[PDB]
Design a binder for this molecule. Structure first.
Ligand SMILES: Nc1ncnc2c1ncn2[C@@H]1O[C@H](COP(=O)(O)OP(=O)(O)O)[C@@H](O)[C@H]1O
Length: 165
């Protein structure tokens, strides 16, 4: 019962909202895929990406740099499955839209659809931090697309209360 370690609320038979650190939730499930909310160049400086990279001792950034050098940068809405680096079975790097740049928020549908390839996914709310989309809106796109087991982890009690009220 890994979720007994965290306040959580089951929303549907697919989606559960969890209050905590997504990295610590994923650590509890060896078969989970952890979602990174990334940018087009996989530069993991801050936000959840910085935290995931630090937890990997910088290995995530090294792997990402090699990928981007070989393939070129990603487009908004793209996703790439990369190594898990002992944090999870794999890390799925998704490029959410940046609302500050007035990018198309509906591209979150593409980000969240990519999660359905995996039986168990631990994800933050993509675009809801640096990229300026409201948590409740990011959640709307997630719940519309989710067809697999998804633990949506939010690290703010204010957003947790807002989504579970
Ligand atoms: N370890 C974490 N676990 C869960 N949520 C996190 C974590 N770190 C940051 N967040 C929150 O996840 C959401 C997306 O964060 P962020 O890294 O800024 O991505 P984006 O650039 O897509 O907006 C934000 O609401 C953020 O505050």
């Amino acid at each position: 019962m890994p979720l007994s370690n965290f306040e959580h609320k089951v929303i549907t038979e697919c989606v559960t909202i969890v209050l905590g650190d997504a990295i610590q939730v994923a650590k509890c499930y060896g078969e989970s895929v952890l979602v990174n909310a990334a940018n087009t160049h996989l530069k993991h400086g801050g936000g959840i990406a910085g935290a995931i990279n630090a937890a990997s001792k910088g290995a995530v950034q090294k792997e990402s740099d090699e990928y981007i050098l070989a393939k070129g940068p990603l487009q908004v809405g793209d996703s790439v499955l990369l190594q898990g680096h002992s944090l999870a079975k794999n890390i799925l790097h998704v490029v959410g839209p940046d609302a500050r740049a007035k990018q198309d928020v509906s591209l979150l549908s593409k980000c969240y659809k990519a999660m359905n390839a995996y039986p168990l996914v631990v994800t933050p709310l993509v675009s809801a931090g640096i990229f300026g989309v409201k948590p409740a809106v990011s959640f709307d796109y997630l719940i519309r697309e989710a067809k697999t087991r998804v633990l949506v982890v939010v690290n703010s009690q204010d957003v947790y209360k807002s989504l579970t009220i």
